[PDB]
PDB file of N, CA, C and O and ligand atoms in Angstrom:
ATOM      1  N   UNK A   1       9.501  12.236   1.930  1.00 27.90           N
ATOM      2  CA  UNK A   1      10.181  11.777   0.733  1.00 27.90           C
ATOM      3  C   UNK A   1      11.573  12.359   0.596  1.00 27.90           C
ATOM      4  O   UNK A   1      12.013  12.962   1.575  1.00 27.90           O
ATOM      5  N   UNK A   2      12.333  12.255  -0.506  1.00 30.28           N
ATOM      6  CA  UNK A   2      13.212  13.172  -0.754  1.00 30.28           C
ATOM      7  C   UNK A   2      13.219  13.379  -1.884  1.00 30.28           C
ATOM      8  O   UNK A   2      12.901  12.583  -2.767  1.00 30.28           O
ATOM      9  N   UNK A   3      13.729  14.922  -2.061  1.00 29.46           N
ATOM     10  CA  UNK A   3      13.809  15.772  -3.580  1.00 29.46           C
ATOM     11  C   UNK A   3      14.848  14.957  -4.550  1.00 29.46           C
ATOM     12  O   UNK A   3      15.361  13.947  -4.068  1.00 29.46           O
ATOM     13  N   UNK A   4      15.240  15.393  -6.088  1.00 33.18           N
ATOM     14  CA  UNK A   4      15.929  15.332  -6.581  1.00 33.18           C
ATOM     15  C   UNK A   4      15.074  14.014  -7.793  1.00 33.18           C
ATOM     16  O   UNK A   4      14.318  13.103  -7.458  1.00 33.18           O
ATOM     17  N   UNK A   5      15.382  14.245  -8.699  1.00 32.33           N
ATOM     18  CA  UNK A   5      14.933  13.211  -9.895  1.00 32.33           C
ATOM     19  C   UNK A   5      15.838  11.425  -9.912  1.00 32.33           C
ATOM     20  O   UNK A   5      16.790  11.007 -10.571  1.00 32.33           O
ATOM     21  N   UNK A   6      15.030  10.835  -8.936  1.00 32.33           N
ATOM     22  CA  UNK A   6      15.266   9.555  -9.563  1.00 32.33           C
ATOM     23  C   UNK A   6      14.064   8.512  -9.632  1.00 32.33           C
ATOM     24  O   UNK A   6      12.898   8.895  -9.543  1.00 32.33           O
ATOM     25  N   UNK A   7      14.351   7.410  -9.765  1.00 28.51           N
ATOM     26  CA  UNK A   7      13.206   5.994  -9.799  1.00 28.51           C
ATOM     27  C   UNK A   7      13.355   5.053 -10.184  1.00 28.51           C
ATOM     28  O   UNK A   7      12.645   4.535 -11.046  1.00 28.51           O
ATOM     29  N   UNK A   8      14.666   4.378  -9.472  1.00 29.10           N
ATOM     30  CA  UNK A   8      15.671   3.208  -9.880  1.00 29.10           C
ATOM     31  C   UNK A   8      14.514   1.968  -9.223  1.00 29.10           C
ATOM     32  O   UNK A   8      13.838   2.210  -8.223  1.00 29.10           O
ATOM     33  N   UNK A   9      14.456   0.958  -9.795  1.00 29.72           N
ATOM     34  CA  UNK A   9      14.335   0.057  -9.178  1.00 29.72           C
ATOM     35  C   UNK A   9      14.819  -0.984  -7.955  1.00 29.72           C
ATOM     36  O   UNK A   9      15.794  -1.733  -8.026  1.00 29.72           O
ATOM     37  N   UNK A  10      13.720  -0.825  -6.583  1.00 28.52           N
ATOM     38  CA  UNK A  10      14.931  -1.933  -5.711  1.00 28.52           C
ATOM     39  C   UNK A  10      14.843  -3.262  -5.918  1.00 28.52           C
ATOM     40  O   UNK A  10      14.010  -4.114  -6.225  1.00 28.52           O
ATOM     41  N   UNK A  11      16.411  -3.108  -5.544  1.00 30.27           N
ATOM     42  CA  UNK A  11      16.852  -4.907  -6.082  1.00 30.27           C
ATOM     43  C   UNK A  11      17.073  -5.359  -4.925  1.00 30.27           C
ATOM     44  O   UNK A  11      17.029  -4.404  -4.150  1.00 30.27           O
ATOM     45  N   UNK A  12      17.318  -6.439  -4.307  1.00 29.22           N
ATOM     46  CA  UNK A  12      17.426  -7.584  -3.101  1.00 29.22           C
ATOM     47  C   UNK A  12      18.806  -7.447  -2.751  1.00 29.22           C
ATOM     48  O   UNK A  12      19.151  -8.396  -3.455  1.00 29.22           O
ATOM     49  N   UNK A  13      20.147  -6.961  -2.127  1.00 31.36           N
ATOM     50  CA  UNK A  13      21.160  -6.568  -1.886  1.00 31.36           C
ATOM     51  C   UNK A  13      22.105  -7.298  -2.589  1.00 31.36           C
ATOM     52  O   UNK A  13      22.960  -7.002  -3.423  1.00 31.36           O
ATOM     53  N   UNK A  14      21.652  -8.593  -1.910  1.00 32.48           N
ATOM     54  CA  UNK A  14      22.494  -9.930  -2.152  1.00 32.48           C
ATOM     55  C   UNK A  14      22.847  -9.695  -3.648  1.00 32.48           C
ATOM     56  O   UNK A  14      22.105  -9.042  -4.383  1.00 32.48           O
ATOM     57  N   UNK A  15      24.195 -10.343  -4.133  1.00 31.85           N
ATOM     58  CA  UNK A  15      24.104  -9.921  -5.408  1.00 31.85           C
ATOM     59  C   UNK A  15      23.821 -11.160  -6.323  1.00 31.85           C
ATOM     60  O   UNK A  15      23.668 -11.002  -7.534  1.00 31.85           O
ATOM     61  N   UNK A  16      23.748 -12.446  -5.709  1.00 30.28           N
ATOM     62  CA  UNK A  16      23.563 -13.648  -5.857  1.00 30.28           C
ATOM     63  C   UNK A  16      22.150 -13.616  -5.911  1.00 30.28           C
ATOM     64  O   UNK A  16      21.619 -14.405  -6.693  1.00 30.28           O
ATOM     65  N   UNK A  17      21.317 -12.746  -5.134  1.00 29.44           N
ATOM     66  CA  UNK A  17      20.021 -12.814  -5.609  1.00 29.44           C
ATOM     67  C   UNK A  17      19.470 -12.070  -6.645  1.00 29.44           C
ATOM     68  O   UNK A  17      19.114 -12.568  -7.713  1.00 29.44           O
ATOM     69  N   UNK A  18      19.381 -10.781  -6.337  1.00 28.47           N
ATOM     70  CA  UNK A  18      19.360  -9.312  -6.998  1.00 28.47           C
ATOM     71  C   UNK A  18      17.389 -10.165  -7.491  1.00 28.47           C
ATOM     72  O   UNK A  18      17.061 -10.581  -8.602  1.00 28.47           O
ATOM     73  N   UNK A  19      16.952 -10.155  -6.854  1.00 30.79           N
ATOM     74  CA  UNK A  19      15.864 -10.320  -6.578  1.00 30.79           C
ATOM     75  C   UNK A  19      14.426  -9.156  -6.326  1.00 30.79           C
ATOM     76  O   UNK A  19      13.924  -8.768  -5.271  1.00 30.79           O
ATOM     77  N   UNK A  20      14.054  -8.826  -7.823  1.00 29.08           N
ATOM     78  CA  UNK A  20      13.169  -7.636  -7.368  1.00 29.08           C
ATOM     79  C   UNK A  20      11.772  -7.566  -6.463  1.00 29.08           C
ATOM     80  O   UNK A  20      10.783  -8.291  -6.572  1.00 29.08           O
ATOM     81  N   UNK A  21      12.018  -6.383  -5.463  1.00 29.42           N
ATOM     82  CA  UNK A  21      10.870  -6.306  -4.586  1.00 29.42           C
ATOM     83  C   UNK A  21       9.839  -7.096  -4.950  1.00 29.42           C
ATOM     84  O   UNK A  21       9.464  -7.216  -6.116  1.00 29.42           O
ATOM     85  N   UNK A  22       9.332  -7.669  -3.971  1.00 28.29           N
ATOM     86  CA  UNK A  22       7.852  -8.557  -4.472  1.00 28.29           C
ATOM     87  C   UNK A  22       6.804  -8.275  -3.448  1.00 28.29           C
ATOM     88  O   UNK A  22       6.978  -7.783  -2.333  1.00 28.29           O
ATOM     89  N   UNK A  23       5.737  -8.648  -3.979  1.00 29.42           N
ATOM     90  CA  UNK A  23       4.522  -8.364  -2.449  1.00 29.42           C
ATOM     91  C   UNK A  23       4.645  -9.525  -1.621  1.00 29.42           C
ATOM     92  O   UNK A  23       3.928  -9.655  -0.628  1.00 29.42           O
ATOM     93  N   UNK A  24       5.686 -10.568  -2.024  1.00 29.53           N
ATOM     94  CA  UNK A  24       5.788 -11.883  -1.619  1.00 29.53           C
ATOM     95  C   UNK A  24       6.769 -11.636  -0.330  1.00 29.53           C
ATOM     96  O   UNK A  24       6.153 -11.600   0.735  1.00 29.53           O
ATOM     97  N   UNK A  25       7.861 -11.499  -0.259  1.00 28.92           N
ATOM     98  CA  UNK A  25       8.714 -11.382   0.687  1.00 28.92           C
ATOM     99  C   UNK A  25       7.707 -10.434   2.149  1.00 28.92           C
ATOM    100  O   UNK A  25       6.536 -10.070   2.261  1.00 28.92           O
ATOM    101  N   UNK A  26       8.785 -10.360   2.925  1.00 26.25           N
ATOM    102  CA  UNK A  26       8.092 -10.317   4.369  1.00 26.25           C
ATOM    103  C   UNK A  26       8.406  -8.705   4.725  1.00 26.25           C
ATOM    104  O   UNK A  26       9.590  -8.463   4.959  1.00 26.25           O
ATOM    105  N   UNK A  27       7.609  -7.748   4.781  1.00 28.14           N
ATOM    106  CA  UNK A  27       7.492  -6.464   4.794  1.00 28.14           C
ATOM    107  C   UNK A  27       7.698  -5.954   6.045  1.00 28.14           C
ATOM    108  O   UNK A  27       6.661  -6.320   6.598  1.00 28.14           O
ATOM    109  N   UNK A  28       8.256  -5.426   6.779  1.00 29.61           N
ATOM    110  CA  UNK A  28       7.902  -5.111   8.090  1.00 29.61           C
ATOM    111  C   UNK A  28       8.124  -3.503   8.134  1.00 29.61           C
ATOM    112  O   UNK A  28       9.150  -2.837   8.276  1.00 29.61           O
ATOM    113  N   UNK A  29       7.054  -3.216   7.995  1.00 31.45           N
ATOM    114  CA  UNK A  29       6.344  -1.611   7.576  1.00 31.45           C
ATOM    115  C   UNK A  29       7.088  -1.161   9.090  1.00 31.45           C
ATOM    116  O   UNK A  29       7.887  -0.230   9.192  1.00 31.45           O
ATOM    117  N   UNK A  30       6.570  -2.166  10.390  1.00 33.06           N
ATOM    118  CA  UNK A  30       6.862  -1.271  11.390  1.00 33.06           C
ATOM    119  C   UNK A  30       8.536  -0.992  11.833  1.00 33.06           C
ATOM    120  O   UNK A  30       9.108  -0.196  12.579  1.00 33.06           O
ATOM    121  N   UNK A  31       8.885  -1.923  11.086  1.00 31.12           N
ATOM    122  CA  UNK A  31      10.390  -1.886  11.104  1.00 31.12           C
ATOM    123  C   UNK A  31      11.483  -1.266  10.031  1.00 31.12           C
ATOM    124  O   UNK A  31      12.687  -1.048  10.165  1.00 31.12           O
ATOM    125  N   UNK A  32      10.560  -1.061   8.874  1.00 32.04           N
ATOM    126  CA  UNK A  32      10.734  -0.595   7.793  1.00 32.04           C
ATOM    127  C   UNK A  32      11.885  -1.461   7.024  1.00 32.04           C
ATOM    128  O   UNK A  32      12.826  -0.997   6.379  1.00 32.04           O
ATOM    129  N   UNK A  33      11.626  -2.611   7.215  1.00 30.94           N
ATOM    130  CA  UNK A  33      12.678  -3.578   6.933  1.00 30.94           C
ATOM    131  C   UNK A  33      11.696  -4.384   6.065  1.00 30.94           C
ATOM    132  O   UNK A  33      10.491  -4.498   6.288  1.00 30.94           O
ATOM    133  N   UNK A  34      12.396  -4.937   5.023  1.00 29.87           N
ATOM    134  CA  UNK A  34      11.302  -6.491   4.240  1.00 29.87           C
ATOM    135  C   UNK A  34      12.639  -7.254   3.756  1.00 29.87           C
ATOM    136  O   UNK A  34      13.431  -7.001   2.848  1.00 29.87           O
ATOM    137  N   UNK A  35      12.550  -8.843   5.234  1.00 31.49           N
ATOM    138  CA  UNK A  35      13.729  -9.818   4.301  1.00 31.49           C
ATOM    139  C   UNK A  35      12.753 -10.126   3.162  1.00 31.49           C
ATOM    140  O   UNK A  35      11.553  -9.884   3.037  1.00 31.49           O
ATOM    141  N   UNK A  36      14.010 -10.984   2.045  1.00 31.06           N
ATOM    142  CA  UNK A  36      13.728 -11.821   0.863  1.00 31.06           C
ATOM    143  C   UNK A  36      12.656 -12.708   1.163  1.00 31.06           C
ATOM    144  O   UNK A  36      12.353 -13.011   2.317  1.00 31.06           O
ATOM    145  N   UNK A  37      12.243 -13.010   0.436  1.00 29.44           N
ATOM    146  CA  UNK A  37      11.082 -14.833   0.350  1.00 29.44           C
ATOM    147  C   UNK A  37      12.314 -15.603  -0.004  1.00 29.44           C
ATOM    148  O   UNK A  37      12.359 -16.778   0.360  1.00 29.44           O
ATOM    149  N   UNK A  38      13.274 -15.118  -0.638  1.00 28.02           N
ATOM    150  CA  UNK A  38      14.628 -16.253  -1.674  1.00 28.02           C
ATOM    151  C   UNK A  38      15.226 -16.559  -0.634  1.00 28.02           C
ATOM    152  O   UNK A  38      14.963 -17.384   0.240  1.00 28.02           O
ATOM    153  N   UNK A  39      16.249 -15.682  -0.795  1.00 24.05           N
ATOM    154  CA  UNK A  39      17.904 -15.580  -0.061  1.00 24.05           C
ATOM    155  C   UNK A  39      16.975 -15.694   1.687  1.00 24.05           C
ATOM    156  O   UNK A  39      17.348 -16.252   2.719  1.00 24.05           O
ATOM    157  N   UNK A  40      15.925 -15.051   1.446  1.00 23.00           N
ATOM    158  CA  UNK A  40      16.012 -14.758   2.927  1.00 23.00           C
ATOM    159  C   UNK A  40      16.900 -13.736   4.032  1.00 23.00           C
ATOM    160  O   UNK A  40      17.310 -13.873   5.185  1.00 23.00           O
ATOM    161  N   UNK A  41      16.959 -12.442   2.806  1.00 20.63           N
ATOM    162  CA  UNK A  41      17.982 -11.929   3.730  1.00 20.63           C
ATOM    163  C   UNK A  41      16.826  -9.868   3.944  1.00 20.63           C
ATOM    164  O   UNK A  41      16.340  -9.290   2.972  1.00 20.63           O
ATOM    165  N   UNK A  42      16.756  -9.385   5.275  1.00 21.01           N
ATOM    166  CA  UNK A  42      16.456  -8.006   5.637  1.00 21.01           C
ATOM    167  C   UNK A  42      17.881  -7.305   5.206  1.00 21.01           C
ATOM    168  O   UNK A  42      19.110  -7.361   5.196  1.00 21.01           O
ATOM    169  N   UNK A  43      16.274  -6.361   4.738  1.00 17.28           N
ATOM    170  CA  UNK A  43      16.720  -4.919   3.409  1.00 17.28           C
ATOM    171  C   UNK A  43      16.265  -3.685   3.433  1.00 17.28           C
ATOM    172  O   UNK A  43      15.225  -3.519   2.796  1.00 17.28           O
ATOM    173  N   UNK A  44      16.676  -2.831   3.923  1.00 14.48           N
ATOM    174  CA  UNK A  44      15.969  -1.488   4.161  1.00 14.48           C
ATOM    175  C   UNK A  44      15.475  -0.774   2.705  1.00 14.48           C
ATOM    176  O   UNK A  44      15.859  -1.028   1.564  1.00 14.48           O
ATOM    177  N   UNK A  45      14.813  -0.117   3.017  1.00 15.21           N
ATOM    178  CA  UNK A  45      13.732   0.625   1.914  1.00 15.21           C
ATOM    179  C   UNK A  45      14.554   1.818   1.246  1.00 15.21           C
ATOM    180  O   UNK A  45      15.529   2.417   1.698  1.00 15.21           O
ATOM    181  N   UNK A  46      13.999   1.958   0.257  1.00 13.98           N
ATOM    182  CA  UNK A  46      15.043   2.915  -0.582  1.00 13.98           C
ATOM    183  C   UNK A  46      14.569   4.709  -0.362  1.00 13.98           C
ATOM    184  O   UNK A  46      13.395   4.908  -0.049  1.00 13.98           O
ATOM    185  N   UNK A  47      15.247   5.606  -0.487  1.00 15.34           N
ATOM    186  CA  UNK A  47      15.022   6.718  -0.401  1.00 15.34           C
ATOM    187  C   UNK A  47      13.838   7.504  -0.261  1.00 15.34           C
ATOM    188  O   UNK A  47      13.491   8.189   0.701  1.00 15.34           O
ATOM    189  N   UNK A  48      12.959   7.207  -1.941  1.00 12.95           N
ATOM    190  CA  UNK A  48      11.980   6.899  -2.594  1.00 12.95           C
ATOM    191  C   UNK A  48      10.990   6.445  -2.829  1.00 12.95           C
ATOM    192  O   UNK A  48      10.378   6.434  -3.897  1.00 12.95           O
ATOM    193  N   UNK A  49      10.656   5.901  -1.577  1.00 14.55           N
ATOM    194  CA  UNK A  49       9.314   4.898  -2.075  1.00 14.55           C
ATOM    195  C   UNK A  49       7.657   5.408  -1.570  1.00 14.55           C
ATOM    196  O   UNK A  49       7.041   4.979  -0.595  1.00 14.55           O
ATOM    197  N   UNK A  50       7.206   6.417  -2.543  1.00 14.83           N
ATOM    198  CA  UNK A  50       6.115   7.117  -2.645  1.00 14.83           C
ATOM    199  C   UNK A  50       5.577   6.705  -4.000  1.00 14.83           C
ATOM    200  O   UNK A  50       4.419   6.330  -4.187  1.00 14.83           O
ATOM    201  N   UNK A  51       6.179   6.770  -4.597  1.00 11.84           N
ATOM    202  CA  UNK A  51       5.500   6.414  -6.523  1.00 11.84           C
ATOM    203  C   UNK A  51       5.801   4.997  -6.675  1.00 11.84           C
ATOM    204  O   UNK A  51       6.396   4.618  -7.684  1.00 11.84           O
ATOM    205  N   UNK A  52       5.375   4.021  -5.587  1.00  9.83           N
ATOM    206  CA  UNK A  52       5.692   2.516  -5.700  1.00  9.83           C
ATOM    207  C   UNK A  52       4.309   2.435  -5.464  1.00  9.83           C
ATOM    208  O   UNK A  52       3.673   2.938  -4.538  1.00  9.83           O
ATOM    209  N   UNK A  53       3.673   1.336  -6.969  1.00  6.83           N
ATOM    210  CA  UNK A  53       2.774   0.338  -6.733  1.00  6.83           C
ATOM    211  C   UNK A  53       2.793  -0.764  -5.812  1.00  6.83           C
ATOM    212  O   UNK A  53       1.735  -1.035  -5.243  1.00  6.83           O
ATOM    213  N   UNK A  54       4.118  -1.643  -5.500  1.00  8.11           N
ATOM    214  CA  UNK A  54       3.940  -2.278  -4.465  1.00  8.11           C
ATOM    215  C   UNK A  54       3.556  -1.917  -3.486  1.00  8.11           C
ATOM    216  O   UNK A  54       2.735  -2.624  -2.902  1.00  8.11           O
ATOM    217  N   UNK A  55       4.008  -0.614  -2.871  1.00  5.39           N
ATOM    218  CA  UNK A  55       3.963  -0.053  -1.257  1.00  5.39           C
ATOM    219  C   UNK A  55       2.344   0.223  -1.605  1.00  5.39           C
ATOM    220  O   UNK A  55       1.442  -0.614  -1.627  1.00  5.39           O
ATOM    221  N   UNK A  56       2.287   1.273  -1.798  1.00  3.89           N
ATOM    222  CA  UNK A  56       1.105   2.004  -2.430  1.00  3.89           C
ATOM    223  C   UNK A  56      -0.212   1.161  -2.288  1.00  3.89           C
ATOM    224  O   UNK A  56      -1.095   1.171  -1.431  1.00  3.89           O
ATOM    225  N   UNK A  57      -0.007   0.333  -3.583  1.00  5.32           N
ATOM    226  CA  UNK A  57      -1.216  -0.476  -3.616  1.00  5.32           C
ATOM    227  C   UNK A  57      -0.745  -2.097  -2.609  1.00  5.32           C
ATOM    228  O   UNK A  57       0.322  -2.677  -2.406  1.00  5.32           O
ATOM    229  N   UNK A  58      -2.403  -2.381  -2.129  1.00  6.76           N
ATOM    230  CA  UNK A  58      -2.192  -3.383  -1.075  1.00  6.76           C
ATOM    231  C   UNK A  58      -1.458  -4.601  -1.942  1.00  6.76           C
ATOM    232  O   UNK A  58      -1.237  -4.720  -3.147  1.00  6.76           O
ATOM    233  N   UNK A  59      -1.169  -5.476  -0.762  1.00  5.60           N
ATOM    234  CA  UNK A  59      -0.803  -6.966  -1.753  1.00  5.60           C
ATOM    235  C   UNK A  59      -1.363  -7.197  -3.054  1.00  5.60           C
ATOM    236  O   UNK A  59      -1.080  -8.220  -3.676  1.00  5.60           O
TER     237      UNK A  59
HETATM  238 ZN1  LIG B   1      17.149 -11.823  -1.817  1.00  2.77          ZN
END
């Protein structure tokens, strides 16, 4: 993980999308990449993502 107090929500880069994480879009755990379901665009994972229900809990 990393230290320090935050727990922003990730948004979809694009700013035309700004599309929040979904269990819908395409995850690639082994790549640590998940493009959009929308825009369709790969997005790397945020700092943070230990106290995420999406990750966390299955689909
Ligand atoms: Zn998007």
């Amino acid at each position: 993980g990393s230290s320090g107090s935050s727990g922003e929500p990730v948004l979809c880069s694009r700013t035309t999308c700004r599309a929040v994480l979904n269990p819908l879009c395409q995850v690639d755990y082994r790549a640590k990449l998940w493009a959009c379901n929308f825009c369709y665009q790969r997005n790397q994972f945020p700092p943070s993502y230990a106290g995420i229900s999406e990750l966390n809990q299955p689909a």
